[PDB]
Specification:
The structure is a monomer. By secondary structure, this protein is an alpha+beta fold. The protein folds into three domains: 1-54, Ubiquitin-like (UB roll), CATH 3.10.20.540; 55-178, Papain-like viral protease, thumb domain (Helicase, Ruva Protein, domain 3, Orthogonal Bundle), CATH 1.10.8.1190; 179-312, Jelly Rolls. The chain is built from nine helices and 19 strands. The strands form four sheets. The chain has a seven-stranded mixed beta sheet with strand order 10-13-18-14-15-16-17. Helix 3 (76-87) runs antiparallel to helix 6 (142-151) and helix 5 runs antiparallel to helix 6 (142-151). The longest helix is centred in the first third of the chain and has 12 residues, at 76-87. The protein binds the ligand Cc1ccc(OCCN(C)C)cc1C(=O)N[C@H](C)c1cc(-c2cnn(C)c2)cc(-c2cnn(C)c2)c1, chloride ion (CL) (4 copies) and zinc ion (4 copies).
Length: 312
């Protein structure tokens, strides 16, 4: 017999002794080692003192699994470990002092989201996400990318939308303090003030210009006469302005970062534009810079702390 360690979070470790004739799967359930499923594999001599991830099979492991991942989904572990086997192969080069991803397995939307999270203020609720968030910024983002895929129910290779991925992640972050107050003015119906919080307070779909949202955007009213909706108050460390891909001019110093989408719907390739001393363009591992930018943009991120309008 040899002794090993089983865990769900790797924070809490549980010591176990295993028999060499019985495979790891029948004694522990579904068992993984550094990405590789060892359910069918029998214990080898090198697997002494090794740390194994196991699907929770008692109440102690179930509670520890929730405390770290904030989910009770039994499929989460498998999907996470399956993505990790690919993300560990990916290359994460440092570009403009930011951690990117060499393009692989259609990850252009993942790198764009990873680059954006390093530039906006965010605190993740699941300790698993926050701990990988920290090490991702340090340059080792394999665990973080695998977790993003699992939490988004996306698999390797699958095409991804950056706005949808950011939304999923925002629901796992503490955006409770974020508030957005809007006013829709209609000549028939009048003035109606609505208050959004959380994900809805930091995301808008319709326009890329944060200024235009402050000025007002035409949206249909219940009566049918198009009404003006404008931003009244905003309390959030950032805002995300999204709109269907269209030609847009990005000016240096007026934004934080943006998403460039090029090609057909659901099969295009994403590029990341950041504002810095000059406009930088990050396409995976490649970097180009220019003073101005005009191209197909679908998401623009802006900085914010507090904002109160002047319209009466
Ligand atoms: C790359 C990708 C992967 C997955 C994905 O999932 C979607 C399915 N979800 C589960 C509903 C979507 C996408 C994608 O194309 N996104 C990009 C950002 C995208 C492109 C276009 C678009 C329009 N014309 N042309 C040539 C492209 C239009 C939109 C858009 C969004 N809202 N409106 C009202 C329009 C967005
Ligand atoms: Cl135990
Ligand atoms: Cl939760
Ligand atoms: Cl959560
Ligand atoms: Cl900004
Ligand atoms: Zn949670
Ligand atoms: Zn692969
Ligand atoms: Zn109306
Ligand atoms: Zn791509």
């Amino acid at each position: 017999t040899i002794k090993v360690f089983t865990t769900v979070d790797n924070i809490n470790l549980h010591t176990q002794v295993v028999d060499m004739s019985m495979t790891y799967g029948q004694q522990f359930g579904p068992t993984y080692l550094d990405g590789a499923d060892v359910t069918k594999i029998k214990p080898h001599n090198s697997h002494e003192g090794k740390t194994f991830y196991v699907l929770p099979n008692d109440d102690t492991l179930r509670v520890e699994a929730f405390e770290y991942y904030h989910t009770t989904d039994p499929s989460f572990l498998g999907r996470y470990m399956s993505a990790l086997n690919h993300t560990k192969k990916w290359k994460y080069p440092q570009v403009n002092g930011l951690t990117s991803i060499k393009w692989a397995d259609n990850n252009c939307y993942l790198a764009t989201a990873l680059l954006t999270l390093q530039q906006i203020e965010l605190k993740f609720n699941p300790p698993a996400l926050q701990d990988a968030y920290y090490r991702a910024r340090a340059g080792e983002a394999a665990n973080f990318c695998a977790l993003i895929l699992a939490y988004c129910n996306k698999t390797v290779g699958e095409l991804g939308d950056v706005r949808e991925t950011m939304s999923y992640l925002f629901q796992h972050a503490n955006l409770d303090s974020c508030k957005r107050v809007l006013n829709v003015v209609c000549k028939t119906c009048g003035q109606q003030q609505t208050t959004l919080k959380g994900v809805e307070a930091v995301m808008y779909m319709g326009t890329l210009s944060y200024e235009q949202f402050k000025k007002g955007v035409q949206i249909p009213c219940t009566c049918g006469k198009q009404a003006t909706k404008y931003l009244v108050q905003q309390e959030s460390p950032f805002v995300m302005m999204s709109a269907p891909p269209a030609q847009y001019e990005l000016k240096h110093g007026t934004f934080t970062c943006a998403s460039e989408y090029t090609g057909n719907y659901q099969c295009g390739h994403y590029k990341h534009i950041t504002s810095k001393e000059t406009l930088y363009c990050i396409d995976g591992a490649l970097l180009t810079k220019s003073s101005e930018y005009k191209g197909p943009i679908t998401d623009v991120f802006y900085k914010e702390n507090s904002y109160t309008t002047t319209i009466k």
